[PDB]
Each structure stands twice: as structure tokens, then as C-alpha cells.
Paper text:
We investigated a TRPM2 chanzyme from choanoflagellates that integrates two seemingly incompatible functions into a single peptide: a channel module activated by ADP-ribose with high open probability and an enzyme module (NUDT9-H domain) consuming ADP-ribose at a remarkably slow rate. Using time-resolved cryogenic-electron microscopy, we captured a complete series of structural snapshots of gating and catalytic cycles, revealing the coupling mechanism between channel gating and enzymatic activity. The slow kinetics of the NUDT9-H enzyme module confers a self-regulatory mechanism: ADPR binding triggers NUDT9-H tetramerization, promoting channel opening, while subsequent hydrolysis reduces local ADPR, inducing channel closure. The structures of srTRPM2 exhibit a characteristic TRPM architecture, from top to bottom, a transmembrane domain (TMD) layer containing the ion-conducting pore, a signal transduction layer consisting of MHR3/4 domain and the C-terminal rib helix, and an ADPR-sensing layer consisting of the N-terminal MHR1/2 domain and the C-terminal NUDT9-H domain.
A cation binding site is found between the MHR3/4 domain and the Rib helix of each subunit, termed MgMHR. This site does not distinguish between Ca2+ or Mg2+ either and is unique to srTRPM2 as the key residue, E1114, is not conserved. Replacing E1114 with alanine eliminated cation binding at MgMHR, resulting in a reduced rotational movement of the intracellular domain around the symmetry axis when ligands were bound, as compared to the wild-type (WT) protein. The E1114A mutation had no obvious effect on macroscopic currents. However, single-channel analysis showed a small decrease in channel open probability and a small increase in channel close rate, revealing a regulatory role of this cation binding site on channel gating.
Author numbering:
A (entry chain C): 628 to 723
B (entry chain C), F (entry chain D): 917 to 1061
C (entry chain A): 724 to 756, 787 to 916
D (entry chain D): 483 to 532, 546 to 627
E (entry chain A): 1062 to 1157
G (entry chain D): 676 to 723
H (entry chain D): 1110 to 1157
Write the structure that this text describes.
């Protein structure tokens, strides 16, 4: 959830009005890069969960978290525009 | 409802990606179509007042000639050429240039632009196939939701 | 280096073609390599394989245009002048093919090339059509059958022009 | 040897050394440098005007080479040289040693470009300024 | 193909053909000619032989040097050196 | 003015690169067009004096038949064949070879040369796409200047 | 230069040099037919 | 001028560091170190 939130905040900051400018280009790129890396991390941890116990991983993905007004991690991932998380076999298995 | 299927759905996403290439082809094709149409329409029927029929004549034949249906019999009839050979023995000598302009035009549209569009489609397809699969898995969630 | 002979490598197709068409006006003002000066420059430029290759192309192009004109224009009631010129031209081509047959590395090496086979088809089609016409020159039907055979020749000579 | 030209006589010792380097490189068989200088069709000062003794004993001076390289680059190259800064009267100036270095490196840099020695070219490029 | 072919184009190549036939008739029946024949000295032949053997030796040295600069060869050579290094340490430990 | 746009400008540069391939296609196509046209024109209308109409007949139909508009009804009318089946019951037996020559010709032009042109376009596109982007950035400076 | 300070790099690219009759480095790069320099993001940023 | 020469020096240091971090250079440098290591063992065996 923290990796998805981190990816979303860096992605939104990279296209924000405060980051536009000739000198900020590399910074923007770095933010986007870090966002992608955090997304990869979120996939990796998820993959490990699906490797250990798929049913327990499904229970984890179906769990409602209080921090986003009581709805699950897949909605958070969709809101964060995380294409890599949604394309993972565990997430697709829960959706199926 | 094709998006549920593993074959029709990503191909639909790829088709929506191509639409920009199709629009690009339309923008390139518009130059030859309007230019050849105004020039050809003036050459076929000169000394005529401008009307809505002139505009319809500019737009109608040039667009449908790039798909291989040639109106050469119709253009031959409009040119008032009475010879056994089609663009010979005409009242005006300028209307005999009508097939030549066309000769450049379909060379521009079918030989050059259509094959370029095929090249853009192959390159575009190879670029966005994996992204189309990923986007299809996201649209799978969208349908589920 | 063997291709250009005793000539600079920067020479283009048009320059050599122009020098071929205008021998006394383009050759002294060009750079490459009295009787023994003019003769030496002529023997060096015209001994090069590239100039004879360009001459053979141009010659075959004229052959295609003149033979195409001959097939399109109506046949006369006797053997016309253009027919005699083409007859002399194809004998000369046939003698050149015989020369190629004698001086190559065997009959198999000559017949391996597809262009030599195309040359044989050219000579064979022209002589059949010519003897078909020449058997009865006032016969309309002989002219029609001869032009039918000569359609195939024009097709092979334009195919042979791709060499 | 002493020369009647005032432009050639104001030149320092290291410029004559670069001229000696050009001469030594030029004296090798089938060298493209000699062909370039002969094909250039210029005088001792590099001006496009096409006596003989001065034109042959000092045929590889740096000014003529500057003109040849100048014609190869573009239509408005004109390097402003100041050999007066190599005199002992300008020693008290603070930053003169950098400029003096830069100019020297530049001339040697051009020589290293002419002989197609990439490694020396890169080294003379490093010491000086105006890298891009 | 175009080295041995006569220069003259196709309508006029009959003149070239009868000229070659005339030369053939003068050589076979008349025997009034003796053509042209040029040879090469032994010095330039030995120069070509010496040049070719020197360049052969130069290519073999360059080829050997290039094969020793490959990554696989360097790793293998480094490995054998490390094996001999272990052997020398065994000798050192024996001396200790 | 298309060169400012990030889509239309590099595609225009790629199109100017293809023009050499288009010219190459024209040179290959010229052999079949002139050969088939002279041969076919002689077969359709024999025993006729040479004129400008003969040359127009050589050039007109062969070029426009490679774009799929076949003049087979027009060729059937010119051949003077009165049978229900088109190339049967003709005055001369040689004119029945007119569809056969054509059969080779469009095999040469549409089946062989057009598909080869598609292959050259895909290869050429992959080769010069990055160079077209770089050249577009240089032409961007050219416009600015 | 573009990595360290983009604005200062832009000032460097806009600076007129006496050695090519008082015009900037991008004109020099265009005259030298340097496609790689012109395609760089810093040069493109100055042109934009 | 100062900015450009500093960035030139910075690029050369970064370029030198990048060329020393390549796999081929590291294998070659490692190889020469192992050759010198064998030399030092020969010296050690001489002392033994
Ligand atoms: C570079 C390109 C675009 C220019 C081409 C030249 C054009 C404009 C010129 C060249 C030859 C000209 C033709 C020459 C002869 C005639 C016959 C006359 O009874 C009507 C006009 C007509 C048919 C001319 C029309 C204009 C023409 C086609
Ligand atoms: C413009 C570039 C691409 C090539 C130029 C070719 C143009 C100018 C040529 C090619 C074909 C030509 C036409 C061919 C035949 C005729 C019939 C004649 O009785 C009058 C001129 C006219 C009508 C010509 C006008 C000029 C023409 C259109
Ligand atoms: C390999 C390809 C590109 C060959 C090129 C074909 C060109 C040379 C041919 C194809 C069709 C031809 C045209 C067909 C009909 C006519 C009408 C006539 O009254 C004047 C000539 C004119 C206008 C021809 C000009 C030449 C033409 C345009
Ligand atoms: C190797 C290829 C190119 C050669 C093909 C052979 C050609 C030239 C020969 C083979 C059979 C021949 C045909 C046989 C019979 C007839 C019927 C006659 O009433 C008119 C001529 C016509 C129609 C001949 C025309 C020429 C012909 C088509
Ligand atoms: C040339 C290579 C590719 C194949 C050879 C096939 C040619 C010679 C054949 C194929 C089809 C044939 C034609 C088919 C039908 C007829 C009608 C007949 O009443 C006279 C002969 C004629 C007109 C034939 C002439 C020869 C022909 C053209
Ligand atoms: C797979 C493809 C290539 C099949 C080949 C098609 C060939 C064999 C066919 C297609 C069209 C045919 C022609 C159609 C019409 C006629 C006119 C007739 O009076 C004689 C035969 C002739 C000239 C035919 C010869 C054979 C032909 C050329
Ligand atoms: Mg032959």
C-alpha cells in the first residue's frame, strides 16, 4: 500500500505545476524512475505472497484498509494507475 | 463486450492506437485529394460558375479512386472525347492532361502512402502489443468493477 | 580499377555517355591516365570495359525501341528496310553468341547463365517470326501470325534489358 | 634564418617548432599533408593569391595552415592571434598563463587534428578551454 | 564478361567479327603474326611472396592477440592462474 | 508547415526517403509496362499505321491495370469477339492470347513487385526512423532560424 | 552542463564567440553538420 | 568559461569512472592484479 502511495505521489509530482521548469527536467525523470521502481517492489512483494500461499494472498488482496475509506488494495492500485500490479497473475486470479 | 475475449479485446485496443496513424494518413492524403480534385475538376469542366456541385465534384471522385475503382469511363464521358482511343480527339487539348495528373495522384496515394501506412502499422503493432495486453488486463478489472 | 581501366574513379554515367556521344568535344577536356597522343587517349578511354558496357546498353536500348516501333508499325507487302536492318542486327547478335559459346569455359558454363538462355529465346523467336513473314510476304495471315510471335520477342527483349 | 617579413619575424620559437613538426611530418612518403598544402594554392600568409625561396623554405608555417583549416570549416573563421603576450613585459598579469597555455594548446591541437593523431588531439583539447 | 568482348556495339559488331575472323585467318593460314606476350621478373615475384608471408605472420599475431583479448579467454586464463596461485600457497603452507 | 508537429513531420522525412524506393519500383515496373503495352497493342489491333494514338494505347491501359481496374470489357470490345464467352469466336486467333500476356503481367506487377515494395518500405522504415527524428530536430532548428 | 545548471547551460549556448564572426554555438554546430549535438535535449530546449 | 571548464573536468572524471566500471576493463585489471600477485608469490617462495 505504501509502495502504491509512493508511486502515485511521485507520478503526480512529476506532472505537477510546481515541477515544471527548464532546470527541473532531470528531477522529474528521477521521480518517474523512482515511482516505476516502487511499482516493481509492490509487484515483487505481491509475487512472494502468491508464491508462499495463494489463498492467503487472495485474503490479503481482499482485505479492506482504513486509510482509503475502507476498500481494498486493487482499487488503490487502479487509482494509482499501476499497470504492472494489475497485470500480475495473482491480481488477475483474484479478479477472475 | 468483445473485451472479455482474449483475442478480440487487445486487438480492439491496438485498433484504437492505430486510429492516430489512420488520422496521420488522412492528413497526408488530404493534400493530394483537395489539390488533384480542384485541379482535375477545373480541367474537366472549364468556364462554369461555382456552385455546390463543383465542391461535390472536387470531393467525390478523388477519394474513391484510391481504392482501385477508377472512374476513367465516367471521366472519358465528361471530357467529350469522341475517339476510339479514350483521351484523344477532344474539343479542348488541355483535358487530355486529366489521366496524367491522376497518374501522379494514385502513385502518390496507393504506391506511396498506403505502403507507408502498412509500415507504420507493423512498427506500431510491435511497439504497443505488450501495453495492449496490460491495458486489457486493466480493462478486465474495469469490466469486473 | 579493372572496370574503369586507365580512367579516374570519380567519372559518372552521364560523363562517359556524353563523351561517347561527343568524342571530339569532351575527351580532350577530361582527366584520365599528335597521332601518338590523340590515339593514346582514344585507345585508353575506349579500351576500358565501362565504355563498351555503356555502348552495349545504349545499343540494346535502341534495339528495343526500333524493334518495338517495327512491331507496332504495319508490315509491307515485301520485306521492308527496317526488317533488313533488324535481320543484320540479329545475325550479328547470333555471331556474338557463337563467339561466347566458343571462347567460354564449356557449353555448361555458358548455358548455366539465365541471360544466355534468354538470348537464345530472342534469336529463335525473331527467326521463326521472320521466316513466317518471309515465306509469303503478301499474305495477310502470315503477317498476323508473325506479329503474334513478335509480341513474345518484344517481351523477351525488354526482359533481357534488365541485365 | 632571419626573414624580411615583419609578420613572420614577430612569431615566437614554439610556432617555428610546430612548423618544424609539420615539415618533419610532411617529409614522409605519400603524406596527405603535403598534397593538401600543394592543392591549397596559397602564398606564405595563406591568402588565396597563388619570392619562391621564401615560399619553399617556410612552406609549412602556422598562419597558412590556419587559413587552410579556416577554409575547410566555414566562410567566417578568423582566429585573432596575440603573440605579444609571450614577451617578458606581460609577466605581472595574473591570468595570462592560462591564456598563454590555451592559445599554445589550440595551435598544437590543430596540428594534432591535421596528422590524425586522436589521442594527442584529445590531450591538447583537455588542457585548453572552449571544449565544445 | 565485358573484358573479352569487342568494343563495337551490336549493329556494327559484324565489322569487329570479320576483323577477328581476318586475324584468325592471318594467324592460322597466313602465319604472319605472333601476338603480344608480357612476363614478370623474379625480383617482383619474390617481393610479392615476402610481402604475403609477412602479412600472413602479421595477421596470425593480430588474430592471436585478439583471441587473447576476449572475455572468455581472459576468465579461463585468470582461472588457471588462480589455480596455480592456490598450488603456490600449498607450497608456502608446507614451508610454514 | 507539417514539420512543427511531432507526428506529421518525421513521417514526411521518411516519405522523402521512400521516394528512392518508389523510383526503384517505377524502374522495375517500366520494363513490364512498355513490353506488355507494345506487345498487347500490336496483338489487339494489327495492320495499322503508327501514329500518336498507338503510343497512347501503349501507355494508357497497362499502367492503370496494376491498380485493379481491368479494361477486359474494353479489350473484349476492341478484339471484335462476338461470342458469349469473351475471348472466343474471334476473327483472328492471335488476339485470344491477349488475356494470357495480361495474366503474366499483373502477376509480375501486383503479386510480385507491389509486395516487394511493401518489404522495401518495412526495411527502409526500420532503418531510417531514428535518423528521421534527428533530421526533424535539425529541421526544427531550420524553421526556428 | 545541462546536468549541473540548465539555465547556465542555456546562457553558455546563447553566448556569442568571436572566432566565428560573433554568433553562437548552435549555428557552429549546424554549420559542422553535427546531428548528435542538435538532437540533444539541452539544445532542443534552447531552440524551443 | 569557468563553468564550461569545470563541467569538462566533471565529464572526464565521470567518463573515466564509467570506463573503469565496465565488465571488460574490470576483468583485464583483475587479470593484471593476479599476474602481479603471482610475481609477489615468486618473491615469497624465494624468501622461504
Ligand atoms: C514544373 C511543372 C509543374 C510545370 C509543367 C509545365 C506546364 C505548366 C506546361 C508545360 C507544357 C504546357 C502545355 C503545352 C501545350 C498545350 C496545348 C494547348 O492547346 C493547351 C495548353 C497546353 C496543354 C499546355 C498547358 C500547360 C503545360 C502543360
Ligand atoms: C510536371 C512533371 C512531373 C512532368 C511534366 C510533364 C507534362 C508537362 C507533360 C506530360 C504529358 C504532356 C501532355 C501529353 C499530350 C498532350 C497532347 C498535345 O496535343 C497537347 C499537349 C499535351 C496535353 C501534353 C501537355 C504536357 C504534359 C502534361
Ligand atoms: C512506370 C510508370 C510510372 C510509367 C509511367 C506512365 C506514364 C509515362 C503514362 C501512363 C499513362 C499515360 C497517359 C495516358 C493517356 C494520356 C492521354 C493522351 O491524350 C496524352 C498522354 C496521356 C496523358 C498519357 C501520358 C503518359 C502517361 C501518364
Ligand atoms: C518461350 C516462349 C517465349 C515462346 C512461346 C511460343 C510462341 C511464340 C508460339 C507457341 C505456339 C504459337 C501459336 C500456335 C498457334 C497459333 C494459331 C494461329 O492461327 C495464329 C498463331 C498462333 C496463336 C501461334 C502464335 C505463336 C505461339 C504462341
Ligand atoms: C510462354 C510460357 C510462359 C508458356 C507458353 C504458353 C503459351 C505459348 C500458350 C498458353 C495459352 C496458349 C493459347 C491458348 C488458346 C489458343 C486458341 C487456339 O485456337 C489457338 C492458339 C491459342 C491462341 C494458344 C496459343 C499459345 C498459348 C499462348
Ligand atoms: C494459379 C494461377 C497462376 C493459375 C493460372 C491461370 C492461367 C492458367 C489461366 C488464367 C486465365 C486464362 C486465360 C483466359 C482466357 C483465354 C482466352 C482463350 O481464348 C484462350 C485461353 C486463355 C488465353 C486463357 C489461358 C490460361 C489462363 C492464362
Ligand atoms: Mg550473351
Amino acid at each position: 500500500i505504501n509502495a502504491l502511495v509512493a508511486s502515485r505521489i511521485l507520478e503526480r509530482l512529476s506532472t505537477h505545476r510546481a515541477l515544471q521548469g527548464p532546470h527541473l527536467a532531470e528531477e522529474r525523470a528521477k521521480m518517474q524512475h523512482n515511482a516505476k521502481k516502487f511499482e516493481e517492489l509492490a509487484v515483487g512483494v505481491l509475487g512472494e505472497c502468491h508464491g508462499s500461499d495463494s489463498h492467503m494472498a487472495s485474503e490479503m488482496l481482499h482485505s479492506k484498509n482504513d486509510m482509503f475509506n475502507k476498500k481494498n488494495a486493487i482499487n488503490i492500485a487502479y487509482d494509482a494507475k499501476s499497470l504492472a500490479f494489475l497485470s500480475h497473475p495473482a491480481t488477475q486470479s483474484v479478479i477472475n | 463486450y468483445y473485451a472479455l475475449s482474449k483475442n478480440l479485446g487487445p486487438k480492439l485496443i491496438m485498433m484504437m492506437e492505430m486510429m492516430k496513424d489512420v488520422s496521420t494518413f488522412v492528413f497526408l492524403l488530404l493534400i493530394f485529394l483537395i489539390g488533384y480534385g480542384v485541379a482535375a475538376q477545373s480541367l474537366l469542366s472549364p468556364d462554369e460558375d461555382f456552385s455546390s456541385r463543383t465542391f461535390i465534384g472536387v470531393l467525390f471522385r478523388p477519394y474513391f479512386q484510391i481504392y482501385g475503382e477508377l472512374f476513367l469511363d465516367d471521366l472519358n464521358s465528361e471530357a467529350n472525347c469522341l475517339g476510339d482511343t479514350p483521351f484523344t480527339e477532344c474539343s479542348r487539348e488541355t483535358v487530355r492532361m486529366v489521366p496524367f495528373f491522376l497518374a501522379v495522384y494514385i502513385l502518390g496515394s496507393n504506391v506511396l502512402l498506403v505502403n507507408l501506412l502498412i509500415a507504420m502499422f507493423n512498427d506500431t503493432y510491435m511497439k504497443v502489443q505488450e501495453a495492449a495486453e496490460d491495458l486489457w488486463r486493466k480493462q478486465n478489472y474495469e469490466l469486473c468493477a | 580499377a579493372d572496370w574503369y581501366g586507365h580512367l579516374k574513379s570519380v567519372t559518372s554515367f552521364w560523363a562517359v555517355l556524353f563523351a561517347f556521344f561527343f568524342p571530339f568535344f569532351v575527351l580532350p577536356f577530361i582527366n584520365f591516365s599528335g597521332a601518338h597522343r590523340l590515339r593514346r587517349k582514344f585507345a585508353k578511354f575506349y579500351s576500358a570495359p565501362y565504355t563498351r558496357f555503356i555502348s552495349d546498353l545504349l545499343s540494346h536500348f535502341v534495339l528495343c525501341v526500333v524493334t518495338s516501333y517495327f512491331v507496332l508499325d504495319k508490315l509491307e507487302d515485301t520485306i521492308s528496310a527496317i526488317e533488313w536492318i533488324l535481320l543484320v542486327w540479329f545475325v550479328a547478335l547470333l555471331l556474338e553468341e557463337l563467339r561466347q559459346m566458343i571462347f567460354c569455359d564449356g557449353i555448361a558454363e555458358y548455358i548455366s547463365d539465365t541471360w544466355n538462355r534468354l538470348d537464345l529465346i530472342m534469336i529463335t523467336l525473331f527467326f521463326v517470326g521472320f521466316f513466317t513473314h518471309a515465306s509469303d510476304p503478301s499474305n495477310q495471315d502470315s503477317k498476323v501470325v508473325s506479329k503474334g510471335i513478335h509480341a513474345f520477342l518484344v517481351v523477351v527483349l525488354w526482359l533481357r534489358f534488365m541485365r | 634564418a632571419k626573414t624580411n617579413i615583419t609578420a613572420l619575424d614577430e612569431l615566437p620559437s614554439f610556432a617555428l617548432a610546430i612548423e618544424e613538426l609539420y615539415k618533419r611530418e610532411a617529409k614522409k612518403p605519400h603524406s596527405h599533408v603535403q598534397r593538401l598544402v600543394s592543392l591549397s594554392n596559397t602564398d606564405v600568409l595563406g591568402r588565396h593569391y597563388r619570392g619562391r625561396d621564401l615560399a619553399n623554405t617556410r612552406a609549412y608555417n602556422v598562419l597558412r595552415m590556419d587559413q587552410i583549416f579556416a577554409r575547410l570549416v566555414s566562410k567566417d573563421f578568423s582566429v585573432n592571434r596575440d603573440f605579444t603576450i609571450y614577451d617578458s613585459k606581460y609577466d605581472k598579469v595574473p591570468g595570462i598563463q592560462f591564456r598563454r597555455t590555451a592559445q599554445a594548446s589550440h595551435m598544437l591541437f590543430l596540428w594534432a587534428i591535421c596528422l590524425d593523431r586522436f589521442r594527442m588531439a584529445r590531450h591538447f583539447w583537455l588542457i585548453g578551454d572552449q571544449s565544445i | 564478361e565485358y573484358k573479352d568482348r569487342p568494343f563495337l556495339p551490336a549493329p556494327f559488331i559484324l565489322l569487329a567479327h570479320v576483323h577477328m575472323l581476318f586475324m584468325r585467318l592471318l594467324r592460322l593460314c597466313g602465319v604472319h603474326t605472333q601476338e603480344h606476350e608480357k612476363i614478370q621478373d623474379d625480383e617482383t615475384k619474390r617481393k610479392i611472396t615476402t610481402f604475403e608471408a609477412l602479412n600472413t605472420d602479421k595477421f596470425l599475431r593480430r588474430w592471436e592477440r585478439e583471441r587473447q583479448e576476449m572475455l572468455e579467454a581472459r576468465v579461463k586464463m585468470t582461472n588457471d592462474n588462480v589455480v596455480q596461485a592456490m598450488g603456490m600457497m600449498d607450497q608456502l603452507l608446507e614451508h610454514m
